[PDB]
Amino acid sequence: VDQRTRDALQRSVQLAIEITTNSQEAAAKHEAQRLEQEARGRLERQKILD
Amino acid sequence: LAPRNKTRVVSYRVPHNAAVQVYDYREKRARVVFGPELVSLGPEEQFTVLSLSAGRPKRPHARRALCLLLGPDFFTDVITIETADHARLQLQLAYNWHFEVNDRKDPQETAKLFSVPDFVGDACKAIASRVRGAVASVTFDDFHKNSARIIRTAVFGFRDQAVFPQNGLVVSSVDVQSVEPVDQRTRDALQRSVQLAIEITTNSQEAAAKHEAQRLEQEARGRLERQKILD
Amino acid sequence: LAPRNKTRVVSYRVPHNAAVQVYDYREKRARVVFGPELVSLGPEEQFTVLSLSAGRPKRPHARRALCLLLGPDFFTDVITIETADHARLQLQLAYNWHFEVNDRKDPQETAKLFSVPDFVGDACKAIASRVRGAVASVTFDDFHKNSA
Numbered sequence: 303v304d305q306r307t308r309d310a311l312q313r314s315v316q317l318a319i320e321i322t323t324n325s326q327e328a329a330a331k332h333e334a335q336r337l338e339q340e341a342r343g344r345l346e347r348q349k350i351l352d
Numbered sequence: 353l354a355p356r357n358k359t360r361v362v363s364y365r366v367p368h369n370a371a372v373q374v375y376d377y378r379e380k381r382a383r384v385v386f387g388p389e390l391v392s393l394g395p396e397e398q399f400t401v402l403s404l405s406a407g408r409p410k411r412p413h414a415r416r417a418l419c420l421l422l423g424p425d426f427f428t429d430v431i432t433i434e435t436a437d438h439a440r441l442q443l444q445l446a447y448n449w450h451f452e453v454n455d456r457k458d459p460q461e462t463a464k465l466f467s468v469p470d471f472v473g474d475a476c477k478a479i480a481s482r483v484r485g486a487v488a489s490v491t492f493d494d495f496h497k498n499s500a501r502i503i504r505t506a507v508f509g510f511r512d513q514a515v516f517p518q519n520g521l522v523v524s525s526v527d528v529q530s531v532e533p534v535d536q537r538t539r540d541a542l543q544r545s546v547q548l549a550i551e552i553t554t555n556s557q558e559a560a561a562k563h564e565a566q567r568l569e570q571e572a573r574g575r576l577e578r579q580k581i582l583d
Numbered sequence: 584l585a586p587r588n589k590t591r592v593v594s595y596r597v598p599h600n601a602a603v604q605v606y607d608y609r610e611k612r613a614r615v616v617f618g619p620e621l622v623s624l625g626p627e628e629q630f631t632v633l634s635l636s637a638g639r640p641k642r643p644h645a646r647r648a649l650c651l652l653l654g655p656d657f658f659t660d661v662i663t664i665e666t667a668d669h670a671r672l673q674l675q676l677a678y679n680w681h682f683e684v685n686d687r688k689d690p691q692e693t694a695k696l697f698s699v700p701d702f703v704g705d706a707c708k709a710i711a712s713r714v715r716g717a718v719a720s721v722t723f724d725d726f727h728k729n730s731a
């Protein structure tokens with residue numbers, strides 16, 4: 303019935319949206335770090351062989 | 353228009369996949385006429401007028417009808433629901449329906465088609481209640497990525513058709529068309545999310561290009577050093 | 584235009600790959616006429632008028648028709664869908680379709696062609712619902728590289 307409860311629920315849903323976006327960003331960052339580490343290791347081994 | 357001749361026998365042409373109900377108030381006998389047949393009223397018979405539901409939000413008493421159409425059709429309703437995260441979002445569904453008349457010569461089963469005064473609004477409100485009940489216990493993200501399965505499981509059960517035994521009406525399928533959040537701020541947040549996803553993809557491609565360039569540079573440097581040693 | 588002669592037998596020329604439904608309300612007998620044949624109404628028969636869907640977004644009740652075309656055709660619709668990354672993107676599809684009439688002499692199977700009041704809108708909305716449901720669980724990049 304009250305508008306203030308609706309406002310609170312709107313803030314809750316916006317926080318949930320922010321949570322989802324932050325989760326996707328963290329997953330992308332972790333994948334990028336893994337790929338960078340793999341590339342660095344391969345480069346170091348190739349330097350040793352050279 | 354042109355006034356009818358009151359002394360002429362009143363007649364009506366039932367369409368294909370349709371039926372009418374008339375009761376002979378004098379001889380005390382009801383009948384349901386099926387198919388494309390032509391129905392002529394007796395001196396005391398009457399037509400069972402049906403007041404149904406229609407409109408974008410399916411308001412009641414918006415379409416008076418004389419014959420009941422019992423062929424494969426569909427009606428669409430706009431359902432507003434809320435998720436477990438309290439995100440308000442409205443739907444647009446389509447309900448494929450048809451009447452299952454096992455025996456067209458049965459005075460009891462055929463009378464059941466007109467038993468429900470308004471099958472359209474009844475079915476729409478029942479399915480809307482089912483969908484609203486099932487969704488409210490589901491978060492916004494899971495519903496967004498799985499709305500089809502959630503809605504199909506909500507409307508039906510554990511089942512391919514949502515049969516209504518009051519009149520024989522069955523809903524053989526549901527087709528969700530649009531799922532849009534009611535509030536603009538949720539749309540803005542989702543736009544920011546999609547822009548961040550685009551940025552993620554571009555950054556990934558840039559990192560891959562940089563790694564390949566570094567590998568090629570290292571290979572060239574090694575070959576150059578070996579050639580210098582040989583020289 | 585020029586008013587028709589009401590006393591003349593009403594006739595219609597069904598095109599190739601088309602059919603009509605007429606019911607003789609007096610003799611109580613329906614029939615579906617196929618092919619390029621010419622259909623003449625009896626004193627009490629009527630034509631089954633079909634109200635179909637048409638337009639760029641496929642609005643309903645935009646094309647009234649008298650004969651049903653059952654030959655290889657296609658209709659196009661504009662579908663707006665959303666990805667798992669919440670990226671809004673609209674589509675333009677084309678649906679190659681045709682009616683499979685196993686027996687043109689069967690009073691039951693041939694009557695099934697006119698069973699659905701509007702096949703165009705029904706098929707368009709069903710396929711749009713399928714496409715929208717499948718895409719929503721797919722990220723934007725995977726859909727972009729593999730939309731087909």
Ligand SMILES: NC(=O)c1ccc[n+]([C@@H]2O[C@H](COP(=O)([O-])OP(=O)(O)OC[C@H]3O[C@@H](n4cnc5c(N)ncnc54)[C@H](O)[C@@H]3O)[C@@H](O)[C@H]2O)c1
Pocket residue numbers: 405406407408417418419420421422424425426427428472643698699700701702704705706
């Ligand atoms: N197979 C198909 O896809 C198919 C078949 C028939 C009709 N259609 C069309 O799909 C459209 C859906 O539009 P909408 O639902 O947004 O419009 P709407 O909400 O105004 O339609 C109300 C519903 O009531 C039903 N209805 C109307 N008159 C009736 C009668 N005399 N007896 C029994 N039922 C009756 C119709 O089937 C319709 O689905 C309908 O207008 C219909 O013409 C589709």
Ligand SMILES: NC(=O)c1ccc[n+]([C@@H]2O[C@H](COP(=O)([O-])OP(=O)(O)OC[C@H]3O[C@@H](n4cnc5c(N)ncnc54)[C@H](O)[C@@H]3O)[C@@H](O)[C@H]2O)c1
Pocket residue numbers: 636637638639648649650651652653655656657658659703
């Ligand atoms: N093989 C082919 O590629 C092929 C074959 C026939 C027609 N076409 C043409 O492709 C075009 C596609 O255009 P659109 O879909 O954007 O226009 P649209 O959306 O206005 O077309 C509506 C659809 O309804 C169908 N239709 C029209 N009148 C009909 C009737 N009396 N009975 C049954 N079905 C009927 C048409 O095939 C059309 O695809 C059609 O106009 C058609 O002329 C292509």
